[PDB]
A paper describes a structure:
The Dbf4-dependent kinase Cdc7 (DDK) regulates DNA replication initiation by phosphorylation of the MCM double hexamer (MCM-DH) to promote helicase activation. At early G1 phase, when the DDK (Dbf4-dependent Cdc7 kinase) and S-CDK (S-cyclin dependent kinase) kinase activities are low, the origin recognition complex (ORC) together with Cdc6 and Cdt1 load the Mcm2-7 helicases onto origin DNA to form an inactive MCM double hexamer (DH) encircling dsDNA to license replication. During this process, DDK and S-CDK, act in concert with various origin-firing factors to convert the DH into two active Cdc45-Mcm2-7-GINS (CMG) helicases which then serve as scaffolds for the assembly of bidirectional replisomes. Compelling evidence in budding yeast has also shown that the essential role of DDK in DNA replication is to relieve an inhibitory effect imposed on replication initiation from the N-terminal serine/threonine-rich domain (NSD) of Mcm4 (residues 74-174), as NSD deletion can bypass DDK function.
The final density map of State I has a global resolution of 2.9 Å with most residues at the DH-DDK interfaces clearly resolved. A striking feature of the DH-DDK structure is that Cdc7 has almost no physical contact with the DH. Instead, the association of DDK with the DH is mediated exclusively by Dbf4 through multiple contacts with the NTD-A subdomains (NTD-As) of three MCM subunits, Mcm4, Mcm6 and Mcm2’ from the opposite hexamer. Motif C of Dbf4 mediates the attachment of the kinase core to the NTD-A of Mcm4 so that the active center of Cdc7 is oriented towards Mcm4 for the capture of Mcm4-NSD with a higher probability than the other nearby substrates. In State I of the DH-DDK, the regulatory loop (residues 504–519) of Dbf4, which is upstream of the M4NB, is embedded in the substrate binding site of Cdc7. The N-terminal residue of this loop, Thr506, is situated close to the γ-phosphate of the ATP-γ-S nucleotide in the active center of Cdc7. Instead, the M4NB of Dbf4 (residues 520-534) associates with the Mcm4-NTD-A by displacing Mcm4-NSD from its binding site in the free DH, suggesting that the M4NB and Mcm4-NSD compete for the same binding surface on Mcm4.
Residue numbers in the entry:
A (entry chain 7): 189 to 564
B (entry chain 4): 176 to 733, 739 to 784, 788 to 853
C (entry chain E): 2 to 110, 129 to 223, 233 to 291
D (entry chain I): 511 to 534, 657 to 703
E (entry chain 6): 101 to 199, 260 to 433, 441 to 467, 498 to 763
């Protein structure tokens, strides 16, 4: 008999969680999978191994259906013919390869059946090593992360992340004249994702969280305790740190049935003499916040804050990529050196602090984009 | 036993019987019970068989389409399974629905013995359009397991490709004996004949395809800018491609907010033109089943802008509805509201209930929503009753919220910010299509706003080069492009609603009005109303303002004000069926007011001089006031109210005619 | 560095209605003929196949009159077009024989079962060697005579493994037709098959050349083939005319069954 | 067993679905023009009970009843 | 034997009876003249190629079956009509047979005129009438009509091969010397060609929907219809909706139809040593017109003799009556821009601009401009744009442009690329779309400096130079300019000169003959009269407009007066 193979009957996706460093310390095990590497440290000797990379996510593609096996129907014999796909491109089948058609003189014609075929939710992400991992005088490089199955939408741009996956080679992409032998591209088939900063929307009232929360409540004076611990090595500025804590928490977003909205986020300005450690406060606040962005006033231009229209080649479509006010959406945008900015960024932030959107009407796009940033 | 289609859980017999029972035995009171609305059940409409009378009027009118609400399937007990089968397997369940609709059309005259012939009905191909299939989850939150499911989406149309012929029947001709055959398309593939079908002529490769004899069908591709209800953290908006077929072609225009329900599809794309090699990553699109262009939350589209489009809708039998159907009961309700003595204050109060006071501002917004009358000269001229309003004022005067409300209430406006917009981005531009890799035309903000209101926030921050585009829009309601690929006049009959601050970011009484506004004279004169909305510090005004913004926070979900649905349908009816005209009594008032303002402008720039455009603004405002009260003629009191609104907008009573300055404590009443 | 994608099939729908001239239906009818034929009270062909499996004789002997008795349509298809129908009946024998072999050695306590040979005999009218005409070409003929010479056993190739000279591409050619003479109806491919197959994702202009395959003889399989010369009966020959003869080719279990001089 | 009347001609998509089918008291009410799984469930249904309480569709019957009362 | 088309032959019979039977009554006398035999006789003495058939004449036959057959299946029945016309002209005027002469049937007076966006796929291969504005005209090119081939190995010549759209080679090879069909070689000298033009048309500005951009269509003219359409005019094309292969639909979403070879009756053997031909079915709608007529670009030839020959007796009598009037100049001034009150000097200037001066060339070679360029400057809301609206809605060969919506290429000429190919084409700019007309440019002040430079160059030499890409061209742009400008600072400063009030450069200013500074003065009488005029306009529309002359008689007088060279 020819049965449907097991591969066409899985409803589950299987992933590898790396061993924790503490459990390795208990049991005298030394594993290469547990230790976070940088992109520079991931060499050709790690191919095929389950390894963990630490870094920032810079690019996330849209979720697309990548076909793993293609299903065809034959009207001549009634069989379903499945051809596997393990490459970026494939050639479709025309004549039926089932036993009944293979033996028969007349060959049937195969038609694609997209409901009977197997797809994976596919995303390609770019990971870049942190500034603490870049050596002296070097430019950060990038690594490609392949996300398939359930793990999609677990990576977003601007996330410090430990990604554990299988380091696998791919066919060479580049000029044919520059290759020497069997050159291969590289990627990381993602198996596990650990966020350094957990998202506020991802918070769940689990059992283990409750005793820590109740311990902090029973310790008392949580307002003053959380205020003065924001930047413990910055002396004084108790009320400044209190309003920075209120910046981190924020108020209640209000919606009325008429349709108008009142924002709940708080915007805080620190204007002061030089040497009052306000840049240290900005660094501390949007290092504490899970979705914080630090920005120097002339370091970001008008296109570097609102939006830019550019092409994604993996999904092959012309997409809008936001600036710092998009990367800090549902977070805090740290805008250092506020008084030395241009009028373009001032107008963009001027619209952001009230309507929480940016409207772009240019030669490329006519759109509005959500930016619910709290601005420091 | 019972047969099931492979890959599904769908039985043709079971689904046919269930949907037939649903069509024969549905009442809209079931929808009332399902939506937890018991007190709104009425005897005369809910207890009538809904789809029976809808299929009857479908028979009388020659309509071949049934618009089916999927929530109604959940209202009925027996079709609650079928609802899921409509969402999971639209491709065959829709065909089952079409077949049983045809059966029901036969049955309604077979059983009841009507005089209609069966041949015309059974020749017709009835098809169903399901809509309201569920929650509007985003495109980017969908998964490959959602392929070939019914999905509902919000969006704005950016552009549409021309009519594309997709080939349904193929016509092959023999070269030597001129014998022809016609072959049907089968799942996108046409079998070309290797040998001639004739017994006498069997020559190989003698069949050639004649491209003009073979039959085609309409296919159009529309680029839709999606506006999800929920947007994840840092999600930047995208454009989808949606394919409409047959009747639905050219039913969506560029710049309209629509409700697309369709099928989630995925196809592989060829990597090269010469090769048949396909890409493993698939391209997703929506195969559109039904388009809803009407929301009860917002106004209907202006009928004066789509007259030939409505005629083409009638010709093509696309029969997608553009305006709300007004019944008799709600029409009588519209008249009894229109006869109320305080109708003007009632309608102005019902504009923005969350915005406190600004009564004259709301009255002007109401009159801009109504609009003046549109007059088409037989010689060829055209006058458009579009009211332009500038709101200049101190910060935090709820004016940006007024722009947000107007943007939500208008059918096809565009919200823009000062200097976040460019001159090219307001009119038209050349873009690169991702699909065809071709240079395509795409409409700017002002052209996309035709038939609606263009809201421009921070009008003072806009650069003068960008600001120069608006002149032709406010004077002729057109934009005349002479660029590299475009030499044409585009209709932009959009009402400009702008917001601005003074130079010092706060109004200065020591400075005059014109210096405070900081707009050039050929620009400011095009505005029908200029509102100086100032923040005066009072006891009672601050107390009531604080109470108004503070009662909003009493509960999580917060006189007499009309509901937004009734307000929208009232304004839609008044715009569609009421065209007031000027009488001689109104003419005398208009002329006397214009000469009075010109005489007042004689005194010695520092003050806003009277303008011919101010006479035209008075005419348009009086026409909008007459259109409000459902009068077909403009009386004298309409002109007096227009003059009062114009004078109170700029606060002419407060200002000194000589110096041009405005006092605060003396004349102004908060 | 990915693997070759594999293609598999699974029967779901009924498909188009079967036709009698289809190869699958001919194979099924032949299989039912083998399994269901009774001479007096016994399945003679089923028992013969089992006994031949026990003695490692991978062939079946079938009488042609039994095919007349069972189904005339497959009989006339076999008679008119033997080179298309004989491999189908051999495939039917092999499908029955694998089923018999698996159920035999696992109950009466790796194994490769080759394609079975069709030997078919009949008692129909024997046309003489002088009345062979062009109407008998590619037809099954019954004809009598005497045997003059039997040739030595030549070795024909059934299963042969080939390897490319420099490309190192490994391929296998299976042959089930050895009964042709003076010509290679199956030959090694003219060019390397690694390019057209595209089995490797990397796909490492490189051409391997004309006829680049060599036969790995240690992993190839062979059968025996013999040439016989059949003369007409010298008792019935015209006085002034030389007797006429034919060359015959036999293979597999038909070889070494006769000696020269037998009738 | 009256059954419900149906259209003469079937659709091409409907005929295409016949090739895709595999395997996994009752009657028809002409008053409500629906099939029912059981009669006693069709008796307790909003359309049948709403049809029963209405008397304007048995008017001819009513006239006949009146005539047959005074024969 | 070939199979015949019974309905096609009866359409041929009905058409050849129509060509000899149809007749109308004479207007002047009442005689019965058969107009199509007269048309054939007219073609006989001038050796014409095209026969013009009115569609209303064809609709009168039978109950309308023949006209409906021609309308729905024009592509199928066109060769049958051609051979029917061939038979009729053979019976009547055989001299047209010899020169074989190709004939073209042009249909006109179709009952309905379709928009560009109303074109649907159900009308492919059907007779149609559309309208549009011509933007690009290609040059006349030969099209392979009757190809003559020579076989590669038999090497005998064969001629008169049918050519239908895509290039085809015969597979008959009637000589019995060789045995293959596919291999042939074209003889371009011996083969026959027809004229061919691809003119691109755009949706008319009144027909564009509310938010959408105009969409274009490539209509192809053949034979005598070639070069009957000019860049920038409104033409009504009657023809057939055809379909043309398009390759750019590969990336489009949806199932693209494809064609593969059916293999069911082909015997095969697995001898060994599996390729098939599959080809895409992707297309775009095009048009093939047999009749081109140019309706006026207005809402409603230099020699005078040809103009007065065109007019009939009644309108030439009306023109003579207009000429004879002694107060004609005042009536001409009062008839210009009736919606505008006052500003008689601007109306005089507009009239003189629409008339213009003579063009003179000296013996040295320099050209003296006869075109009058007028700039209207003044205070806001002085009806300075109403004049431009009147000139564009009235004057022939007039275009309207805004200052900021302008461009250097859009006003003069553009070098453009189609389908990302190696071919570069020329878009005619606004100055050439108004050639021997008026280019009306509102907000000349808001125009940037580069476009002002590119337009005063075309005011200097009255020509346009192109050197972009591989295209070097000299283009004719002799055009009067009606500019509207606002002063710097908004209002007009009386204390400053005209140069100080305007940012328009000195080369721009030096070539404007008239500078009309129209100003607002506040006095009760004229403000009251102007307000009364405007409210009467709003009340009465066309009833409030009572000019001395209507637009059509004004245009006839202007076109008559432009023939004079004072
Ligand atoms: N209150 C403070 N407590 C501790 N360290 C401080 C304090 N104020 C200043 N410093 C130190 O002085 C330096 C201040 O650096 P910054 O953060 O750049 O201050 P600043 O206010 O941002 O200066 P700018 O850029 O001119 S506004 C750091 O080295 C701080 O550690
Ligand atoms: N009179 C009012 N009625 C209701 N809400 C008000 C009023 N005045 C201020 N607000 C609210 O106060 C906030 C101020 O934002 P906006 O008034 O929208 O800003 P703005 O008036 O446009 O002035 P800008 O942004 O500086 S140009 C909003 O949440 C308003 O809803
Ligand atoms: N003198 C006038 N005679 C007739 N109509 C006038 C006059 N002045 C103004 N109008 C009318 O008032 C309106 C003025 O519109 P426009 O002609 O666009 O103003 P404008 O003269 O172009 O000034 P700018 O430069 O555009 S601000 C139009 O409806 C005119 O018909
Ligand atoms: Mg600092
Ligand atoms: Mg604001
Ligand atoms: Mg103007
Ligand atoms: Zn098959
Ligand atoms: Zn033929
Ligand atoms: Zn090789
Ligand atoms: Zn019932
Ligand atoms: Zn030849």
């Amino acid at each position: 008999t020819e049965l449907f193979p097991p591969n066409l009957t899985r409803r589950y996706f299987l992933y590898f969680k790396p061993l924790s460093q503490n459990c390795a310390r208990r049991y005298r095990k030394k594993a290469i999978s547990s230790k976070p590497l940088s992109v520079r440290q991931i060499k050709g000797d790690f191919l095929g191994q389950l390894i963990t990379v630490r870094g920032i996510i810079t690019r996330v593609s849209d979720v697309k259906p990548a076909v793993e096996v293609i299903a065809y129907t034959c009207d001549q014999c009634g069989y379903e013919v499945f051809q596997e796909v393990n490459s970026r491109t494939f050639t479709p089948l025309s004549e039926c390869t089932s036993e009944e058609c293979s033996q028969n003189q007349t060959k049937g014609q195969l038609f694609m059946s997209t409901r009977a075929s197997k797809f994976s939710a596919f995303q390609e992400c770019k990971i870049q090593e942190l500034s603490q991992q870049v050596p002296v005088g070097h430019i950060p490089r990038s690594l490609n992360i392949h996300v398939n199955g359930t793990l999609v939408r677990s990576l977003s741009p601007g996330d410090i992340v430990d990604v554990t996956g299988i380091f696998l080679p791919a066919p060479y992409t580049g000029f044919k004249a520059l290759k020497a032998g069997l050159l291969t591209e590289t990627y990381l088939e993602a198996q596990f994702v650990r966020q350094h900063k957990k998202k506020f929307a991802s918070f769940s009232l689990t059992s283990d969280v409750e005793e820590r929360v109740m311990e902090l409540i029973t310790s008392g004076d949580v307002y003053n305790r959380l205020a003065k611990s924001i930047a413990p090595e910055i002396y004084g500025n108790l009320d400044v740190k209190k309003a920075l804590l209120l910046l981190l928490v924020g108020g209640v977003d209000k919606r009325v049935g008429d349709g108008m909205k009142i924002r709940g986020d708080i915007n805080v300005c620190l204007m002061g003499d030089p040497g009052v450690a306000k840049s240290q406060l900005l660094k501390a606040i949007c290092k504490i916040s899970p979705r914080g962005v630090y920005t120097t006033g002339k370091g970001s231009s008008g296109v570097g804050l609102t939006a830019a229209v550019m092409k994604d080649p993996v999904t092959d479509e012309m997409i809008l990529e936001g600036g710092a006010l998009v990367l800090a959406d549902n977070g805090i945008c740290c805008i250092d050196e506020f008084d030395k900015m241009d009028e373009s960024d001032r107008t963009a932030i001027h619209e952001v602090m009230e309507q929480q959107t940016i409207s772009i009407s240019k030669a490329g796009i006519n759109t509005t984009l959500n930016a619910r940033t709290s601005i420091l | 036993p019972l047969r099931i289609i492979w890959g599904t859980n769908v039985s043709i017999q079971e689904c046919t019987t269930n949907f037939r029972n649903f069509l024969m035995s549905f009442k809209y009171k079931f929808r009332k019970i399902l939506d937890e609305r018991e007190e709104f059940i009425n005897n005369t409409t809910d207890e009538e068989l809904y789809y029976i009378k809808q299929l009857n009027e479908m028979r009388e009118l020659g309509t071949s389409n049934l618009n089916l609400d999927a929530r109604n399937l959940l209202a009925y007990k027996q079709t609650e399974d079928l609802y899921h089968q409509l969402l999971n397997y639209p491709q065959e369940v829709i065909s089952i629905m079409d077949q049983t609709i045809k059966d029901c059309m036969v049955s309604l005259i077979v059983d009841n013995n009507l005089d209609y012939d069966l041949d015309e009905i059974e020749t017709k191909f009835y098809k169903v359009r399901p809509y309201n299939v569920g929650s509007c989850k985003g495109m980017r939150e969908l998964n490959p397991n959602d392929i070939d499911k019914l999905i509902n989406l919000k969006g704005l149309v950016l552009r549409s490709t021309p009519v594309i012929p997709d080939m349904k029947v193929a016509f092959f001709k023999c070269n030597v004996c001129d014998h022809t055959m016609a072959v049907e398309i089968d799942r996108g593939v046409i079998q070309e004949p290797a040998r001639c079908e004739r017994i006498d002529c069997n020559e190989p490769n003698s069949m050639s395809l004649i491209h003009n004899r073979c039959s085609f069908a309409d296919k159009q591709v529309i680029k839709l800018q999606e506006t999800p209800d929920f947007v994840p953290d840092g999600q930047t908006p995208h454009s989808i491609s949606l394919c409409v077929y047959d009747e639905l072609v050219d039913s969506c225009r560029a710049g309209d907010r629509i409700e697309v329900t369709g099928t989630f599809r995925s196809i592989p794309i060829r990597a090269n033109s010469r090769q048949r090699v396909l890409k493993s990553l698939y391209k997703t699109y929506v195969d559109v089943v039904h388009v809803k262009k009407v929301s009860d939350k917002r106004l209907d589209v202006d009928t004066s802008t789509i007259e030939q489009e409505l005629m083409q809708n009638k010709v093509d039998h696309n029969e997608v509805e553009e305006v709300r159907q007004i019944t008799d009961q709600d029409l009588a309700k519209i008249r009894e509201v229109a006869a109320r003595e305080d109708l003007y204050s009632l309608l102005a109060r019902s504009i923005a209930p969350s915005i406190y006071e600004l009564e004259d501002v709301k009255k002007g917004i109401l009159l801009q929503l109504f609009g003046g009358t549109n007059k088409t000269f037989t010689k060829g001229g055209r006058y458009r009753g579009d009211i332009n309003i500038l709101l200049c004022g101190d910060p935090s005067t709820s004016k940006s919220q007024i722009l947000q409300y107007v943007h939500k209430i208008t059918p096809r406006g565009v919200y823009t910010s000062g200097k976040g917009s460019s001159a090219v981005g307001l009119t038209a531009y050349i873009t690169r299509d991702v699909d065809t890799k071709q240079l395509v035309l795409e409409s700017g903000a002002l052209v996309l706003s035709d038939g609606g209101v263009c809201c421009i926030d921070e009008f003072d921050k806009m650069s003068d080069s960008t600001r120069s585009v608006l002149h032709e829009v406010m004077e002729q309601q057109t934009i005349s492009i002479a660029k590299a690929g475009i030499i044409t006049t585009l209709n932009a009959r959009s009402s400009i609603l702008a917001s601005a601050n003074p130079i010092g970011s706060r109004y200065n009484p020591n400075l005059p009005v014109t210096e405070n506004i900081d707009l050039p004279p050929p620009l400011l004169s095009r505005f029908d109303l200029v509102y100086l909305v100032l923040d005066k510090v009072d006891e009672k005004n601050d107390r009531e303002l604080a109470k108004h913004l503070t009662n909003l926070y009493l509960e999580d979900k917060p006189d007499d004000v009309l509901p937004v649905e009734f307000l929208t349908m009232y304004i839609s009816y008044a715009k569609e069926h009421i065209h007031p005209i000027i009488t001689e009594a109104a003419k005398t008032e208009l002329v006397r007011a214009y000469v009075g303002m010109r005489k007042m402008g004689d005194d010695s720039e520092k003050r806003i001089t009277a303008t011919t455009r101010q006479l035209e603004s008075m005419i348009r405002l009086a026409e909008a006031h007459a259109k409000m009260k459902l009068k077909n003629v403009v009386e004298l009191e309409d002109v007096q109210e227009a003059v009062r609104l114009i004078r109170s907008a700029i606060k002419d009573y407060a200002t000194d005619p000589k110096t041009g300055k405005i006092d605060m404590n003396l004349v102004q009443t908060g | 560095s990915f693997d070759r994608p594999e293609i598999y099939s699974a029967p779901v729908l009924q498909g188009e209605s079967p036709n009698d001239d289809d190869n699958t239906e001919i194979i099924k009818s032949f299989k039912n003929f083998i399994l269901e034929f009774r001479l007096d009270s016994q399945f003679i062909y089923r028992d013969q196949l089992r006994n031949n499996i026990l003695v490692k004789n991978y062939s079946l002997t079938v009488n042609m009159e039994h095919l007349i008795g069972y189904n005339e349509d497959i009989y006339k298809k076999l008679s008119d077009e033997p080179s298309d129908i004989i491999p189908l009946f051999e495939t039917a024998i092999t499908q029955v024989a694998k089923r018999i072999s698996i159920l035999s050695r696992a109950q009466s306590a790796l194994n490769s079962l080759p394609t079975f040979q069709l030997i078919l005999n009949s008692n129909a009218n024997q046309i003489p060697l002088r009345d062979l005409d062009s109407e008998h070409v590619s037809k099954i003929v019954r004809l009598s005579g005497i045997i003059i010479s039997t040739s030595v056993l030549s070795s024909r190739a059934t299963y042969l493994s080939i390897m490319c000279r420099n490309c190192r591409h490994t391929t296998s050619i299976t042959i089930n037709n050895f009964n042709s003479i003076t010509g290679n109806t199956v030959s090694l491919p003219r060019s390397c098959l690694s390019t057209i197959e595209s089995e490797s994702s990397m796909a490492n202009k490189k051409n391997c050349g004309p006829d680049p395959y060599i036969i790995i003889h240690e992993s190839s399989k062979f059968i025996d083939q013999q040439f016989l010369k059949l003369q007409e009966i010298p008792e019935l020959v015209p006085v002034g005319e030389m007797p006429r003869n034919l060359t015959m080719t036999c293979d597999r279990y038909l070889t070494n069954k006769v000696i020269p001089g037998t009738r | 067993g009256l059954g419900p009347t149906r259209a003469s001609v079937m659709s091409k998509n409907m005929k295409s679905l016949s090739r895709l089918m595999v395997d996994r008291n009752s009657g028809y009410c002409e008053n409500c023009r629906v099939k029912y799984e059981s009669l006693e469930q069709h008796i307790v249904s909003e359309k049948h009970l709403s049809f029963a309480e209405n008397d304007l569709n048995f008017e001819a019957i009513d006239s006949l009843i009146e005539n047959l009362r005074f024969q | 034997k070939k199979v015949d088309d019974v309905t096609g032959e009866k359409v041929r019979e009905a058409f050849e009876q129509f060509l000899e039977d149809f007749s109308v009554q004479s207007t002047d006398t009442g005689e019965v003249e058969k107009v199509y035999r007269a048309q054939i006789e007219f073609m006989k003495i001038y050796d014409l190629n095209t026969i013009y058939i009115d569609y209303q004449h064809l609709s009168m036959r039978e109950n309308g079956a023949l006209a409906m057959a021609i309308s729905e299946q024009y592509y199928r029945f066109l060769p049958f009509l051609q051979k029917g016309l061939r038979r009729v002209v053979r019976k009547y005027a055989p001299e047209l047979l010899n020169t074989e002469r190709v004939f073209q049937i042009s249909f006109f007076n179709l009952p309905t005129v379709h928009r560009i966006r109303d074109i649907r796929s159900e009308k492919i291969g059907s007779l149609l009438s559309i309208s549009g504005t011509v933007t690009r005209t290609s040059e006349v090119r030969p099209e392979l009509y009757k190809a003559s081939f020579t076989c590669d190995m038999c090497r005998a010549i064969v001629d008169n091969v049918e050519q239908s759209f895509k290039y085809t080679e015969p597979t008959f090879c009637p000589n019995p010397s060789c045995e293959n069909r596919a291999f042939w070689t074209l003889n371009v000298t011996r083969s026959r060609f027809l004229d061919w033009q691809k003119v691109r048309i755009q949706e008319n500005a009144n027909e564009i929907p509310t938010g959408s951009m105009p969409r274009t269509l490539d209509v192809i003219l053949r034979g005598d219809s070639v070069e009957r359409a000019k860049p920038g005019d409104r033409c009504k094309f009657t023809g057939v909706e055809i379909v043309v292969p398009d390759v750019t639909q590969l990336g489009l979403p949806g199932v693209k139809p494809s064609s593969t070879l059916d293999t069911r009756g082909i015997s095969k053997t697995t001898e060994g040593l599996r390729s098939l031909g599959v080809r895409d079915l992707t297309y775009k709608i095009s048009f093939l017109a047999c009749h081109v007529i140019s309706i006026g670009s207005n809402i409603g030839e230099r020699d005078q003799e040809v103009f007065l020959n065109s007019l009939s007796s009644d309108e030439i009598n009306e023109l003579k009556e207009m000429v004879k009037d002694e107060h004609i100049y005042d009536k001409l001034v009062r008839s210009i821009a009736p919606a505008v009150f006052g500003h008689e000097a601007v109306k005089k200037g507009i009239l003189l601009q629409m008339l213009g001066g003579v063009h003179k060339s000296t013996v040295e070679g320099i050209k003296l401009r006869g075109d009058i360029n007028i700039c209207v400057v003044g205070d806001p809301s002085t009806s300075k744009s109403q004049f431009l609206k009147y000139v564009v809605g009235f004057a022939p060969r007039s275009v309207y442009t805004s200052g900021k919506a302008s461009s250097a290429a859009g006003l003069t000429a553009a070098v453009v690329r189609d389908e990302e190919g190696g071919d570069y084409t020329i878009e005619a700019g606004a100055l050439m779309l108004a050639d021997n007309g008026i280019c009306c440019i509102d907000e000349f002040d808001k125009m940037d400096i580069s476009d002002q430079v590119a337009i005063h160059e075309a005011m200097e030499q009255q020509t346009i130079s192109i050197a972009k890409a591989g295209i070097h061209a000299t283009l004719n742009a002799r055009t009067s300019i009606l500019a509207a400008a606002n002063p710097v600072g908004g209002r007009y400063n009386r204390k400053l000169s005209l140069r100080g009030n305007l940012n328009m450069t000195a080369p721009i200013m030096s070539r404007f003959d008239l500078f009309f500074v129209i100003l607002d003065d506040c006095n009760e009488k004229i403000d009251t009269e102007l307000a009364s005029h405007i409210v009467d306009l709003h009340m009465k529309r066309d009833e409030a407009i009572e000019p001395p002359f209507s637009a059509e008689q004004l245009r006839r007088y202007i076109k008559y007066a432009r023939t004079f060279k004072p």
